[PDB]
Amino acid sequence: GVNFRFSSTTMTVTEGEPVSMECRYSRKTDDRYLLWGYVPRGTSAIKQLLYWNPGSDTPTYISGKPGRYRAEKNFRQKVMKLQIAKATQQDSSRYFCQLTDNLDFCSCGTTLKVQAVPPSSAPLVELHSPFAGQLRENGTATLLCLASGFYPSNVRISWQMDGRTVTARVSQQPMCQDEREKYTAVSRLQLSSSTWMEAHRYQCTVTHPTLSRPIVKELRTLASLSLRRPTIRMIPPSIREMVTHRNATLGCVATQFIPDPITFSWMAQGLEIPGTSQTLVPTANEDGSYSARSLLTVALADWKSGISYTCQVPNAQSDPKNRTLRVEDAWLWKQPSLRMTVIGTHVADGGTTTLACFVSAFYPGDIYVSWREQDTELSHGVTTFPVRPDPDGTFHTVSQLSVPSRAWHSGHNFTCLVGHQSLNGLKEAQLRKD
Amino acid sequence: GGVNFRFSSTTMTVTEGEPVSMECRYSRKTDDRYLLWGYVPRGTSAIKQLLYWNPGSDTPTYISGKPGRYRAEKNFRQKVMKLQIAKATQQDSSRYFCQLTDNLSNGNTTDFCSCGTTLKVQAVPPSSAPLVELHSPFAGQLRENGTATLLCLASGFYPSNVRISWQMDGRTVTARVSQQPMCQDEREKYTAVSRLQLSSSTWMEAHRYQCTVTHPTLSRPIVKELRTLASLSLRRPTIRMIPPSIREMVTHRNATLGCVATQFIPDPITFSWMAQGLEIPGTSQTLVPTANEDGSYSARSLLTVALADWKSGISYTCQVPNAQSDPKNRTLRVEDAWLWKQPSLRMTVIGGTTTLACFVSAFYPGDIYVSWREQDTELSHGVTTFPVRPDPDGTFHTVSQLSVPSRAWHSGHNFTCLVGHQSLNGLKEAQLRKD
Numbered sequence A: 001g002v003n004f005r006f007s008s009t010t011m012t013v014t015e016g017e018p019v020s021m022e023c024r025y026s027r028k029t030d031d032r033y034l035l036w037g038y039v040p041r042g043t044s045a046i047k048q049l050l051y052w053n054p055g056s057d058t059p060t061y062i063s064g065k066p067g068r069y070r071a072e073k074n075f076r077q078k079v080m081k082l083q084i085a086k087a088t089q090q091d092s093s094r095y096f097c098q099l100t101d102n103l104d105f106c107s108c109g110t111t112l113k114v115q116a117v118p119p120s121s122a123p124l125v126e127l128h129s130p131f132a133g134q135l136r137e138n139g140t141a142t143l144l145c146l147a148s149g150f151y152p153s154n155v156r157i158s159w160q161m162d163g164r165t166v167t168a169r170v171s172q173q174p175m176c177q178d179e180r181e182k183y184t185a186v187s188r189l190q191l192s193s194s195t196w197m198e199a200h201r202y203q204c205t206v207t208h209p210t211l212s213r214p215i216v217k218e219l220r221t222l223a224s225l226s227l228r229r230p231t232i233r234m235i236p237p238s239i240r241e242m243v244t245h246r247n248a249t250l251g252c253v254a255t256q257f258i259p260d261p262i263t264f265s266w267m268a269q270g271l272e273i274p275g276t277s278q279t280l281v282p283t284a285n286e287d288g289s290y291s292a293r294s295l296l297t298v299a300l301a302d303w304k305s306g307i308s309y310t311c312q313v314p315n316a317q318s319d320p321k322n323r324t325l326r327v328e329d330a331w332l333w334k335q336p337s338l339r340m341t342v343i344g345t346h347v348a349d350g351g352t353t354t355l356a357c358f359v360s361a362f363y364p365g366d367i368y369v370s371w372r373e374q375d376t377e378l379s380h381g382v383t384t385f386p387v388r389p390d391p392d393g394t395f396h397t398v399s400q401l402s403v404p405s406r407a408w409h410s411g412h413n414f415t416c417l418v419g420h421q422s423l424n425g426l427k428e429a430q431l432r433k434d
Numbered sequence B: 001g002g003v004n005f006r007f008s009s010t011t012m013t014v015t016e017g018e019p020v021s022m023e024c025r026y027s028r029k030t031d032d033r034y035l036l037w038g039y040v041p042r043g044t045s046a047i048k049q050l051l052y053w054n055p056g057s058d059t060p061t062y063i064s065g066k067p068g069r070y071r072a073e074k075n076f077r078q079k080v081m082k083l084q085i086a087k088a089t090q091q092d093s094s095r096y097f098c099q100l101t102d103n104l105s106n107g108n109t110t111d112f113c114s115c116g117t118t119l120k121v122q123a124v125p126p127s128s129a130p131l132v133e134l135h136s137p138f139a140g141q142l143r144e145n146g147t148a149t150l151l152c153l154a155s156g157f158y159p160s161n162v163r164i165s166w167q168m169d170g171r172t173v174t175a176r177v178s179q180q181p182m183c184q185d186e187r188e189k190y191t192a193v194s195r196l197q198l199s200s201s202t203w204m205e206a207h208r209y210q211c212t213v214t215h216p217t218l219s220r221p222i223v224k225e226l227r228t229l230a231s232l233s234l235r236r237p238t239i240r241m242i243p244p245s246i247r248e249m250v251t252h253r254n255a256t257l258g259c260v261a262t263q264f265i266p267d268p269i270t271f272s273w274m275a276q277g278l279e280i281p282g283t284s285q286t287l288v289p290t291a292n293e294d295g296s297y298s299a300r301s302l303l304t305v306a307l308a309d310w311k312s313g314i315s316y317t318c319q320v321p322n323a324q325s326d327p328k329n330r331t332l333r334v335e336d337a338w339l340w341k342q343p344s345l346r347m348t349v350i351g352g353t354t355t356l357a358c359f360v361s362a363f364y365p366g367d368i369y370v371s372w373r374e375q376d377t378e379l380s381h382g383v384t385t386f387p388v389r390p391d392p393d394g395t396f397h398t399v400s401q402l403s404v405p406s407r408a409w410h411s412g413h414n415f416t417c418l419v420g421h422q423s424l425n426g427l428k429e430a431q432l433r434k435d
């Protein structure tokens, strides 16, 4: 007569769920009473719950309420089962499979622990993405939908784009659980460069029984400025350089939205000019875009001949319209007319006489006006007004020079020089006193 | 009798290499029978004996003389019998029985009562490396005002000895860092989530956040970084003042001052006008700004006053909520009257088309109004007034030309050049005829 308990074992069940205890025996003769018993809470004696008579597979319940227990003996498979239908906390006891020959008791037992049902909680949903702004760079993306801290594990995470349910490229890692029996699910939606850089409305919808309405997170992305074609602007040569240095410098300003170094190439009449292709580092701007500038110097004769100079940067517009600098048709040029006058008439004094040079009837409007006292260039007192357009289609301007009366009444020569595109040199107009 | 029970609804699980501690409790009150530990070898159905205790003795008598991997212990006081396996192997996965009998050997000792269980031996999970992901709300310059929550996720790693830490601008941050309890999937891989809550102020500032994840499967810590610039939505509106145009002052005889407020928030901007510091009633007005090519929004408010009030020297100030406190670049006042210079006019002929020139010089400030009249009729065609240019003398000067057909110049008409300036109470005239 011995009641063993394997105290290094236990059976755990959630409150309300059924328990299925089972014992295997090695007897080859069905000649003994088989019993299922349990030790009630607060005592130390094994109260009998049910038994089978030797040779009979019919359970003989003696205690409890016939409905809470379900027994089953099968001498073929050598099994004796006892099931508790709806586990309660009071069921947490020691349970024994017993064998005896008359009501010499040999029993083998274990313990039963009854855990509570975890409190149902609602999932916290978080939708995350890489930088989803306008300045978003080119590349593939991975949208993330995290749902944490919920019970039970019957959560559904779905993806939508522009109202349409998306199924491809949706990967959800295996379900997860912490020490507090709260679950965590992670869904990911992988997006190609094309779709990611377009304006779209992504949505993650999470459905859970603790929620009457699904939790919907939204990400509304505008079209990416990284797919905008680089803008090229041309800077024509300055007349100042054309008359002074007699070089001609053309400029090419390329504005991208990618900070990558920009490589510029120059073509003359379609053919690339050797030794002129050059790469420069762009410069960040106000809107976030980057801008670089390339310069190309040519001879004055080549520029005035009518050569078409084209600027090309990789991935630009095919129309060479806003990318080409060429001198205008020669029959459209108008030579500037110069008209000088003097205003601001013992004299002596610190009086100032002002000389005016009217430059009119020229095309295009780029003009260079300078003043010279004999054979010396003047910088002080010179005021060249901006060029204004004519109803005749040409342009006109005025240039003033304030000189002390000491130099005008002495008898110096005052020259107004005008350099223009339609001139092979500089057109002079002299003005002396007497 | 004689029965070998096994509670088949129970089992014991151990990781390979770790020790196993089996234990049985008995209800016998006399230490008068042999207690033994046995196990069923893999591939049979008979209980092979492993060790036994003589009745009354707590000293183990192992069946093989040497307890190598096994270590037994009986204590009849507490009625306990324990058996420990040092490093569980896969062959240790068997059925184990604590047995009681009154006589050993002799085949069928008809007093064999045994209680048994099973033992499962699991392998150590393969160590994997954590995938680290740092996430945040929109972290651009135009990021909206509000509190933020940065997230550092580390998934798919083993074992669970991972460390997630946060840094701001190189300084380790500890406050407001919350990590939910560690988590585990069916493949015994762990997942940890750390969160850093940030107040509106700190989030809207330029900062360098960092999440550092350390794990034994990593030779070098994984560091994720998020560099946010200062937000332009907390930028104070910039106010620019527009003084009245002399054109309006001479024609309409009012004086309209302008206030251009530039924010980065599209909210309607409320303007208030003060005269000599005191607010002018009826002038507070809120209007909706207009976005420009920069992301900012800009609005303009106008205030009309009498010419006498403006020219007297009253200081007019423009105020917008949450703007600069210094009223210097927010105030419009006419300059001291002794700094004004009246414009000097000099007419000439330079030119069929004859062109007349009117040189207006030595005036301050530079706002000037030039008009032409043929006797008593204002001219609009052929008039060209050049922009005002500064003098080394400190004043300003400009030219206005008029191209007229030779018929009117050679006929003998009066050609008047009118000039209105701030230093003039009317219009200064200069006539030029042929004769």
Ligand SMILES: *[C@@H]1O[C@H](CO[C@@H]2O[C@@H](C)[C@@H](O)[C@@H](O)[C@@H]2O)[C@@H](O[C@@H]2O[C@H](CO)[C@@H](O[C@@H]3O[C@H](CO)[C@@H](O)[C@H](O)[C@@H]3O)[C@H](O)[C@H]2NC(C)=O)[C@H](O)[C@H]1NC(C)=O
Pocket (backbone or CB within 6 Å): B252, B253, B254, B255, B304, B305, B306, B307
């Ligand atoms: C130049 O500015 C003066 C100053 O007037 C002030 O600014 C104006 C833009 C308006 O907002 C005015 O309300 C404000 O006071 C203007 O003088 C104003 O002229 C009008 C029209 O003549 C006057 O209204 C009339 O006034 C008389 C007498 O007060 C009443 O009988 C009429 O029923 C009617 O209200 C107004 O009073 C007067 N403001 C004064 C004197 O302070 C002036 O019109 C303006 N110039 C132009 C060309 O607009």
Ligand SMILES: *[C@@H]1O[C@H](CO)[C@@H](O[C@@H]2O[C@H](CO)[C@@H](O)[C@H](O)[C@H]2NC(C)=O)[C@H](O)[C@H]1NC(C)=O
Pocket (backbone or CB within 6 Å): B145, B146, B200, B201, B233, B234
């Ligand atoms: C950005 O939001 C913060 C947080 O709301 C604002 O700071 C304070 O916010 C409280 C509560 O909403 C308000 O009552 C206070 O007026 C705010 N005070 C200060 C001193 O900031 C903050 O003002 C907001 N910033 C902008 C530019 O709107």
Ligand SMILES: *[C@@H]1O[C@H](CO)[C@@H](O)[C@H](O)[C@H]1NC(C)=O
Pocket (backbone or CB within 6 Å): A138, A139, A140, A193
């Ligand atoms: C966009 O980025 C992907 C890599 O993510 C690359 O394959 C693709 O070529 C990029 N697009 C362009 C136009 O360079």
Ligand SMILES: *[C@@H]1O[C@H](CO)[C@@H](O)[C@H](O)[C@H]1NC(C)=O
Pocket (backbone or CB within 6 Å): A245, A246, A247, A248, A297, A298, A299, A300
């Ligand atoms: C023009 O440009 C060339 C090439 O840079 C330079 O060597 C030369 O001095 C310049 N000469 C004139 C006349 O412009």
Ligand SMILES: *[C@@H]1O[C@H](CO)[C@@H](O)[C@H](O)[C@H]1NC(C)=O
Pocket (backbone or CB within 6 Å): A317, A318, A319, A320, A321, A322, A323
């Ligand atoms: C040049 O710019 C104008 C105006 O922006 C545009 O109409 C024209 O198509 C452009 N030419 C090109 C891109 O070749």
Ligand SMILES: *[C@@H]1O[C@H](CO)[C@@H](O)[C@H](O)[C@H]1NC(C)=O
Pocket (backbone or CB within 6 Å): B324, B326, B328, B329
């Ligand atoms: C006013 O504006 C000027 C513009 O350059 C600036 O330099 C100056 O500091 C401003 N003064 C203020 C805000 O008091």
Ligand SMILES: *[C@@H]1O[C@H](CO)[C@@H](O)[C@H](O)[C@H]1NC(C)=O
Pocket (backbone or CB within 6 Å): B375, B412, B413, B414, B431, B433
């Ligand atoms: C021009 O006006 C003046 C007065 O300013 C007058 O004496 C003269 O006769 C006028 N000439 C003509 C042609 O009307």
